Each structure stands twice: as structure tokens, then as C-alpha cells.
Amino acid sequence: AIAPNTRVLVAGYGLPAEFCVTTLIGMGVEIDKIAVATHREDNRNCGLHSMLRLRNIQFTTAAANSEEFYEFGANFAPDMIISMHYRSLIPGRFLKLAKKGSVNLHPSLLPAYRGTNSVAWVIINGESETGFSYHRMDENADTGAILLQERISVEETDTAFSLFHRQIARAMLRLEEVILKLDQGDPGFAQLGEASYYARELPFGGVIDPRWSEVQIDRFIRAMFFPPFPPAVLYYVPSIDIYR
Amino acid sequence: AIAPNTRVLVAGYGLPAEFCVTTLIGMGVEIDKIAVATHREDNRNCGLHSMLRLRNIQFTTAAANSEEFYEFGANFAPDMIISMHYRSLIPGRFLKLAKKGSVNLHPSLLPAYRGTNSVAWVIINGESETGFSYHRMDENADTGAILLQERISVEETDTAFSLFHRQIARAMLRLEEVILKLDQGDPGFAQLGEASYYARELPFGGVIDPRWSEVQIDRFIRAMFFPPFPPAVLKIDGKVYYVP
Numbered sequence: 001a002i003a004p005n006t007r008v009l010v011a012g013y014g015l016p017a018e019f020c021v022t023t024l025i026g027m028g029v030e031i032d033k034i035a036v037a038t039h040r041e042d043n044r045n046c047g048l049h050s051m052l053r054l055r056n057i058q059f060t061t062a063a064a065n066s067e068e069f070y071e072f073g074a075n076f077a078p079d080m081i082i083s084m085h086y087r088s089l090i091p092g093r094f095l096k097l098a099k100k101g102s103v104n105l106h107p108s109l110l111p112a113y114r115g116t117n118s119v120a121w122v123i124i125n126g127e128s129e130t131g132f133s134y135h136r137m138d139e140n141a142d143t144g145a146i147l148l149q150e151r152i153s154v155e156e157t158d159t160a161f162s163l164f165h166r167q168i169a170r171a172m173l174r175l176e177e178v179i180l181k182l183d184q185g186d187p188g189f190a191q192l193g194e195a196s197y198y199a200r201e202l203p204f205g206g207v208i209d210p211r212w213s214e215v216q217i218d219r220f221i222r223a224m225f226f227p228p229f230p231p232a233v234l235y236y237v238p239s240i241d242i243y244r
Numbered sequence: 245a246i247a248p249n250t251r252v253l254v255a256g257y258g259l260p261a262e263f264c265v266t267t268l269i270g271m272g273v274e275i276d277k278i279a280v281a282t283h284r285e286d287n288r289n290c291g292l293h294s295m296l297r298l299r300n301i302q303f304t305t306a307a308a309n310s311e312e313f314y315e316f317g318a319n320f321a322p323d324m325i326i327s328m329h330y331r332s333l334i335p336g337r338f339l340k341l342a343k344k345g346s347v348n349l350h351p352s353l354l355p356a357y358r359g360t361n362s363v364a365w366v367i368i369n370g371e372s373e374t375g376f377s378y379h380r381m382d383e384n385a386d387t388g389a390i391l392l393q394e395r396i397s398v399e400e401t402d403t404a405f406s407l408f409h410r411q412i413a414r415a416m417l418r419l420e421e422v423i424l425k426l427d428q429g430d431p432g433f434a435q436l437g438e439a440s441y442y443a444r445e446l447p448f449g450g451v452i453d454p455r456w457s458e459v460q461i462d463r464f465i466r467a468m469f470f471p472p473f474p475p476a477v478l479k480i481d482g483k484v485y486y487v488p
């Protein structure tokens with residue numbers, strides 16, 4: 001058991017947050033001991049919103065760097081913060097409010113593939129394995145101590161889509177354990193190894209270079225496959241079948 | 245791994261269904277090989293609906309007994325049917341469409357606690373132990389062969405609300421494994437032991453009988469806690485009063 005009267009602030013977006021909140025409830029964290037910071041209701045985030053509305057769980061949508069956000073966290077007074085696909089950098093002074101600190105879910109084997117488009121870049125780079133890292137948040141992104149990593153094999157048929165979704169599902173499976181690590185004060189271990197970082201641009205502008213081998217082309221196609229976004233171009237190429 | 249081109253129809257509602265569709269995509273099931281039956285857009289079922297529009301997964305909200313619903317199944321031609329908290333009895337002829345059969349998630353250890361309110365009756369009866377059952381669907385409700393049961397211990401602090409959500413959370417951790425059993429044709433085992441049944445109504449109309457002992461009133465109060473709904477009622481001098 002998590003302590004009674006442990007206060008938990010979830011900063012999150014979409015299913016992972018919904019699942020976290022659900023998990024917290026099954027662990028016996030009462031509604032008034034839960035608060036959610038999120039973003040406006042949208043096509044990914046309206047399962048979370050409808051839950052918060054139905055159950056009357058307190059929440060904010062205010063920007064991470066705003067006084068209203070800080071005020072929301074300060075009034076709540078969290079013991080721990082759980083970032084579950086939160087889409088902004090959380091300022092240091094906000095994290096400071098949580099005496100038992102925090103955790104974020106990142107869909108790579110950190111410090112490898114920090115940043116954005118991680119599942120795309122892993123496919124493009126031809127990785128045989130990737131994974132997910134639950135790590136403490138310090139004031140920079142994805143640099144804080146590792147509480148839990150798990151390895152996920154990348155299949156030859158995986159797409160950005162397939163791998164993104166398996167990342168979520170498998171990560172949820174460890175979430176209860178990680179909350180319990182945070183509760184017990186587990187310090188985790190500092191990130192060691194070859195860091196890498198990727199930004200918000202898809203490479204080659206989403207465009208196939210025909211001098212690439214069949215192996216580079218297929219990778220790119222599979223890394224670009226993510227409905228409803230447009231696929232790789234040559235014209236619209238969602239599979240290596242079509243490429244031929 | 246799931247046999248590729250396996251066509252899967254999910255009958256469901258809310259987070260369990262969203263999680264299921266997420267898992268299936270994570271397992272490499274293509275979008276045109278998924279189809280969903282659900283109900284009209286709800287404050288519980290908003291997550292799912294937006295997922296289905298977003299990824300353009302085909303779906304219906306027609307009634308389970310309707311010709312439109314049956315045609316939706318007919319045209320999709322599922323290999324398997326996954327009921328994740330679907331709220332109607334699915335006609336037998338509709339189940340016959342899936343040649344690898346079906347599975348439903350029920351939150352008890354079947355055959356105990358067939359029917360609605362299983363989480364509340366478990367608490368009311370003073371079970372220290374319950375669980376969830378993934379079972380094949382017969383023409384009748386909650387009778388078919390068991391593919392997977394896991395035990396969930398009940399605490400003295402558990403409410404219907406904490407237990408309901410823990411049921412969900414824990415059941416999701418076994419979903420992939422259940423899907424693979426269906427894929428590989430595990431017939432499961434016949435439900436053994438003595439079947440108990442509980443009425444569709446809310447237990448004792450949510451009203452505390454004062455002939456009950458302290459222990460039975462405590463359980464009932466915990467069994468009745470489920471926000472946003474009304475809690476246990478005590479009536480005093482022909483007058484309704486909600487319990488804390």
C-alpha cells in the first residue's frame with residue numbers, strides 16, 4: 001500500500017493519464033487527494049477530460065509556465081507529481097512543491113532518444129530494441145534519474161504507429177510498481193551512456209530518397225506510418241508493397 | 245505473435261475498450277482489421293469515440309439486437325470478438341460470426357457473482373477475496389469457458405469505487421496474454437463450482453436496514469461509495485439522509 005493521505009498530482013494527456021488516475025483509485029487514493037494538470041480537451045485528451053468531469057476530480061489546463069498553474073499545484077500541495085505524456089516542460093519551482101519528487105514516462109531507453117519522434121527515429125535507425133524509461137524530472141527534459149526501464153523488442157514489421165501503441169500498453173503494465181517506488185523514496189540511478197536527441201521535424205521532410213537501399217526505404221516508410229498523418233512520399237507510400 | 249490478417253471486432257465501452265484497441269495496434273493489428281461496437285457517446289465513452297474518429301477505425305453504435313448491428317458484424321467478418329465492458333447481451337447469431345470465438349471481461353471469479361454490481365455484492369458479503377474472469381461468451385450471460393482468472397484480494401478499506409478501478413487496472417495487465425490464447429484456440433475450462441446471481445437493481449435500494457450489525461453497515465456504506473452517484477441512504481423519521 002501507498003500511504004493513506006498521500007496527495008498525488010498527475011500532469012498528463014490522453015490514455016496514459018486516464019489509466020494513471022484509474023490506477024491511483026484502485027490503490028485507494030481518494031478523489032480529494034488527486035489533482036490533474038492537463039491541456040485543453042481534444043481528439044486525444046477527451047477520455048481524460050470526461051473522467052475528470054464525471055468524477056469531479058480537480059484539474060487545470062493552464063500553461064506550465066503560468067502563475068495559475070503554479071497556484072494550482074501550490075493549493076493542492078502534492079506529495080508526488082506523475083507526468084504521463086504531459087506536453088510542456090514543467091518549471092523547477094513547481095516540481096519543488098512535491099516533497100517526494102516526481103516521475104515522467106519517456107518512450108525510449110534514456111539517455112538514448114531523448115526528445116520527440118522517438119518511435120520514428122528508432123525505426124529509421126534500424127534499432128532491434130528500444131524501451132521505456134520512468135525517470136524523475138529535474139528542470140531539464142528527460143535527464144533525471146531512472147526509476148524503471150523496460151526493454152521492448154522492435155519487430156521488422158513495426159511501424160511508428162504499432163510501436164507507439166505497444167509503448168503505451170507495456171508502460172501502463174509497470175505503472176503501479178513505479179508509483180510505489182516513488183512512495184518509498186527509491187532514489188533511482190543517474191543516467192549513464194550515449195545520449196542522443198531529436199527535435200520536432202520529421203527527417204527528409206517525409207520524402208523518400210531513391211538511392212537509399214530497400215532497407216532504408218522500408219524503415220522510413222514504416223517510421224512514417226501513423227494515421228491520420230500523411231505517410232512517406234515519392235506518391236503516398238504507406239507500405240513497401242506500394243513502393244513496388 | 246498474433247497471426248497476421250486476424251480480424252478483431254471489439255465490443256466495448258470506455259477505457260477498457262480504448263486500452264484494448266491500443267493493445268491490438270501494439271500487437272501489429274492493422275486498422276482495417278479492427279472494428280468496434282459501442283454505445284452512443286457518453287461521459288464514460290468519450291475517449292473511445294474520439295480515438296475511433298481520429299484513427300478512422302470503423303464502428304457502429306447500433307443496438308445489439310438490431311439488424312444494423314448484425315450487418316456491421318457480417319461485413320467486417322471477424323475472426324474473434326472481444327467484449328470489453330459492452331453493456332448489452334450480444335445475440336448468439338452475432339457470436340457465431342467469429343470462428344475463433346470470443347471473450348468477455350467480468351469482474352468476479354466466475355461462476356460466483358454472475359450479473360451486475362459484482363464489486364458491490366463482494367464487499368457487502370464480506371469477501372476477503374475476489375478477482376476477474378476472461379471467459380468465452382455463450383448465448384447466455386457470464387456462463388462460458390474461462391480463459392484466464394486472476395485473484396484480487398479485498399481490503400477492509402476498499403469501496404466499490406476503489407475495487408472497480410483496481411479490477412480494471414489489473415485485468416488490463418493480462419489482456420495481451422488473453423488475446424493470444426484466443427488466437428491460438430485455447431478452449432479454456434468449463435465453469436466449475438456453484439453459481440451465485442445478483443439482481444440488476446441497486447442492492448437494498450441503497451438504503452441501510454437498521455437491523456444490520458455494525459460490520460454489515462460498514463460494508464454496505466463501502467459498497468455504496470461510487471462517485472458521482474448517491475451514497476448509502478439512512479432514513480430517519482420517514483426522512484432521507486445521505487451518509488458521510
Ligand SMILES: C[C@H]1O[C@H](OP(=O)(O)OP(=O)(O)OC[C@H]2O[C@@H](n3cnc4c(=O)[nH]c(N)nc43)[C@H](O)[C@@H]2O)[C@@H](O)[C@@H](O)[C@@H]1N
Pocket residue numbers: 086087088115116117118119120160161164202223224225226229230231
Ligand atoms: C516528448 C515530446 O512530447 C511531444 O512530442 P512526441 O514526439 O514525443 O509525441 P507526439 O507529438 O504525441 O507524437 C506521437 C508520435 O506521432 C508521430 N507523429 C507526430 N507528428 C507526425 C507527423 O507530422 N507526421 C507523421 N507521419 N507522424 C507524426 C510520431 O511518430 C510520434 O512519435 C511534444 O509535446 C514535444 O514538445 C515533447 N518534447
Ligand SMILES: Nc1nc2c(ncn2[C@@H]2O[C@H](COP(=O)(O)OP(=O)(O)O)[C@@H](O)[C@H]2O)c(=O)[nH]1
Pocket residue numbers: 359360361362363364404408446467468469470473474475
Ligand atoms: N452507488 C451507486 N453505484 C452504482 C450505481 N450504478 C452503478 N454503480 C456502481 O458501478 C459499478 C459498475 O457499474 P456498471 O458498469 O454501470 O454496471 P454493471 O457492470 O452491469 O454492474 C458497480 O459495481 C456499482 O457499484 C448507482 O446508482 N449507485
